[PDB]
Structure formats: C-alpha cells, structure tokens
Symmetry: D2
Subunit: 26 residues, 4 copies
C-alpha cells in the first residue's frame, strides 16, 4: 500500500521535473 | 538535459518501488 | 524555489522508505 | 537493504536538484 502510493508520487514528481525541463527549453 | 535525465531516473525508481510493493504482496 | 521544494519532497520520501525497510 | 539504497539515490537527486536551482 504505502510503497505503491510513494511510487505514484515519484512518477508525478518525474512529470513535474520534465515539465520544468521543458519550460526551461521554451 | 540534466532535469530530463533525472525525471527518467525518478520514473524508473517509481517502477522499482512498485515491483518491490508487488513482491511483498505475492 | 520549486526545485528546492521537490528536493525536500525527495528527502521526505527517502526517510519514509528507510522507515518501511525497518518496519518489516 | 534495497530500500535504503533507493533512499540514498533520492537524497543524491535532491542535492542535484538544489545545485540546478542555483546553477541558473
Ligand atoms: Na500517491
Ligand atoms: Na536517466
């Protein structure tokens, strides 16, 4: 349960960092 | 560049934690 | 900024994972 | 164990993000 929730959190952080990486490019 | 690579790393950690969460269940 | 807030998030998760390791 | 190694990974990334924040 707790590890699955933390896994989803880390996936979401990954998407947030990718969006920041993109905004920096554009 | 570096943020995109770290984003991929965090996605991969997410899959590793999800696999650990699963192994624990089964 | 925003990256610092994410960095703190990751350090919080690291503490949670260490706690889970020792829970079982 | 394995979770501790991932926790250390996350603390390493947190330091990288803090460095990127201050790079620019
Ligand atoms: Na979650
Ligand atoms: Na990578």
């Amino acid at each position: 349960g707790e590890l699955k929730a933390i896994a989803q959190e880390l996936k979401a952080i990954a998407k947030e960092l990718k969006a920041i990486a993109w905004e920096a490019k554009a």
